[PDB]
RNA sequence: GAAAAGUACCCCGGGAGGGGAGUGAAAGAGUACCUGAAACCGUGUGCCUACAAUCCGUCAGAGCCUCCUUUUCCUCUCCGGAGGAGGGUGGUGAUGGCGUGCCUUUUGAAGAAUGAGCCUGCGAGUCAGGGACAUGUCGCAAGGUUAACCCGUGUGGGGUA
RNA sequence: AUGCCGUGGUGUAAAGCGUGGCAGUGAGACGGCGGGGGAUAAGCUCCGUACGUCGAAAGGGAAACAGCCCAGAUCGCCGGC
RNA sequence: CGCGGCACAUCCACCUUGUGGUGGGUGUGGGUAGGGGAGCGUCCCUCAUUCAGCGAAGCCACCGGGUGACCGGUGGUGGA
């Protein structure tokens, strides 16, 4: 956000008349170029978003995961849990003794005993769902981990 | 590049000119190169190089009559007119080494240098020259070659 | 001593005698004939092609000094007009020996 | 990955900055006259 | 070579050309002499100078252990200080500006046999 | 995003001043004055460079007078004879020569003198 | 009447210092104890003790 | 300044202020206080300047001064560059040539045509819209595309009117 | 006489035409050659010329000089004509 | 004209024998309003990498560097 004039209180008086005072052609004493002025062509609250095709979307994300796979950095999970609850420790041991890098991208759905729990406070890690499968993070992180509930989903999603 | 400016390389002779038969104009010019060292192949216009002039028999420089009762000389004071006008025959029967002197100076470049080669000028209206303690060496005039 | 033409110019050189010259193909340590147009041993004053075409100057390079660095621009008037560049000279300097 | 990701030859053309000097376009750099042109952009209509 | 004894004063007063007008009077004279004629300065301006070559004794002979006799000023300083300003009205309601101009003096003595 | 532009200005105006010093008043010490004399001095110095080349050639040839004339020959027919004799010497060594060897510039002269023709007729 | 132009830095310190007070002593001035100096105009009110300092 | 540890004490001084001690990692952190720019004032100092006129410079360019390499040499030499010659950075720059300040606006300007005292900071071609014409590039391919709205969490999937 | 339309050969990195996008100019001055107004006038003014230059072009020369004469600077050179 | 260094079109020969470049030759390169093309620098965000209280940034001076908008290095102050 910014503000202008208009949205600045006072300015309508127009002292310093224009013939005998040595002075400039005021006119106002909040234009730009006095301080306390207001901004020319300043930062409007702009709302934007570059609406795209989903042609282009899928194609994208599609292609990322490709180059990952033959790069062969997919690691398709069955689950994550001793039993019922989380574990930090034990997520950390598997994913560090598995992946062996920083950034981890996580594919799990709807389950949040310790798919969704055990990969928090993992700097470096991000998890999320199949329909709020984005392209940044998937470029982003190296080791793509996959749920077998995820890839039939999405996979028959996907025809 | 260079080899002349250099300060104590200036040798600065006593040249004499006995200035009777030779007319105004050619004297003050042979006079004036001379002076300044274009005869020289160390001449330097940065530097008041040169041999010095002697003018004798000023009163003699040969000047037609019809200009010594035409060609005036104009000494203009500062105050309104104040024009002293002044005939050239008559500053010869005064102070003929002022008109020689003038000529020579309105051959020399507008500069300071002009006042230091000025200095080293004398002249003398009569033939007689005080100054023999140096080196006098009579110079003569001619037109070279081609 | 000699005048030897090179580069364009002539320059005044002498056995054993350091000189900044024109950029040529050369590079550590060679010796790069170069013609003349006087040769002057003290006393005899050559002029001839007999001459000038039978001695040269053979000098060795040891390096390639940069010249100076010209910052520039040209300013007009009040039309409004500024163009700035530079400018240097890449010379190389010769030892003369012959 | 990111750091290899760039885009396609051809788009992203820079923006012409216009009041930046002489250097890129002028003074008034684009309603280089002093009539109507220097104030306000004239309907085509007219 | 010359162990020198400083001493200086802050937030004067006195304005800093009238200050250099009196210590131009001073540079390369000894103490005493200096002192003597600060004090039959007609300027009477010259005061707080004399005070603060007085210092200047005092810290040379007290701190430094030198003999005020011998002391000689190496050199002076008439420092602009901080400037304050008062307006003052005058006809017309032009409303103009008197400053109040201060110094920073220092002063630097030093024994020369 | 305020940037605020201080760094940038004060880039170009520092280089320039460092640059200004010797100038006299403010034009050594001010940006918006020294700039302007710097457009006039390096205006200058680009017509002078040229000057300056055009120059040295007037002082190496009234040199070159000099002593042509006390070897009682002018100029012009010193070097119509260098010409002629096919001396292809330039005016700045051939200057050098005049001070540091007048006898071989004397010999060059006699090259010249044998190369003329005879007079101003053809 | 105003000033057209600033005066150069040059003619500006010339004018400033040319703005000085003159110089008097005397020395030998013999007084009770101390030889205090003074001025010749006021050394007669010095050998009445009619000074202080 | 992390903390008040707020310079006890002593000495000039009417006091303010300062100095010597001292705290503090630091006082180049002293209430007037992080860094402390520029205009500006001022001290010291290398060079030039009181017979000379030019937008106040540039190019030539002498001779001094600072620094510095090679070298005769000081052989005191297992020390050093003292001094000197020569050579070379960075100042000053005697003296000569050359040359009518920026911008704006004008057929035409250095202007006796206008505006600017100097420094610092701020200050003027940008944004919304499935707007419109043309263009480069990227998806698809007689197709392409969704808006509103829904679900969902990083803005993903639906949704054919 | 010049000038102009059109054709056929010759010569020249190339200019031109049509088609789209984005601007400026829309006050001109002087000189050369032809003309009107004015007095056989003007540093006057209104036109014409596939005449130039300045304007938007620095440099040389004309003492100095936007418009005349020569000459169209990429940069450097202590090289020549 | 000579002796050398950059640049845009074009001709020729190569690398993808115009993606874009490499080697050579000719001609070209004064320019305001103004059109076109490629660039310099500052602040912020993301990603990767990386120096840093064994002293960052800012600032001052110095020595060098690029064709340009400018840069790098060294030293001092200061302290994130």
Redesign the interface.
Known sequence: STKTRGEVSGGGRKPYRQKGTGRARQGSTRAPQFTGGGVVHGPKPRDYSQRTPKKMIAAALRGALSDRARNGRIHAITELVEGQNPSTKSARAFLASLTERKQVLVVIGRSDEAGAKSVRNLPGVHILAPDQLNTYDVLRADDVVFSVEALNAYIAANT | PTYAPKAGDTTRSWYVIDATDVVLGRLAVAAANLLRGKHKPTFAPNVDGGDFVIVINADKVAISGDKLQHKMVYRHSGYPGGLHKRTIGELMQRHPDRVVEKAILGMLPKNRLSRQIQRKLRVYAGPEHPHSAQQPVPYELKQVAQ | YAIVKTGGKQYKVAVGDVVKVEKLESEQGEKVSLPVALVVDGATVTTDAKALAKVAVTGEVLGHTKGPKIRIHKFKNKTGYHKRQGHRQQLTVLKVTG | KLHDLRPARGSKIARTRVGRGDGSKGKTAGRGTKGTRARKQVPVTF | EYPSAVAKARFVRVSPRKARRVIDLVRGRSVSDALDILRWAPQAASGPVAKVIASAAANAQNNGGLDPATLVVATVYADQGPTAKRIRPRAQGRAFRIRRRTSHITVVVESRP | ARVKRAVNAHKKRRSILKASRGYRGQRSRLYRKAKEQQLHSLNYAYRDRRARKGEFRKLWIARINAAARLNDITYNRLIQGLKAAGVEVDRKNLADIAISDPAAFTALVDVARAALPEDVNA | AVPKRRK???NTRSR?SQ???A???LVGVTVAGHA????RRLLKAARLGLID?
Do not use: G, N
């Open positions: 150069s830095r040059s400033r703005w000085k007070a110089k008097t002593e205090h100096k003074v001025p300092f």
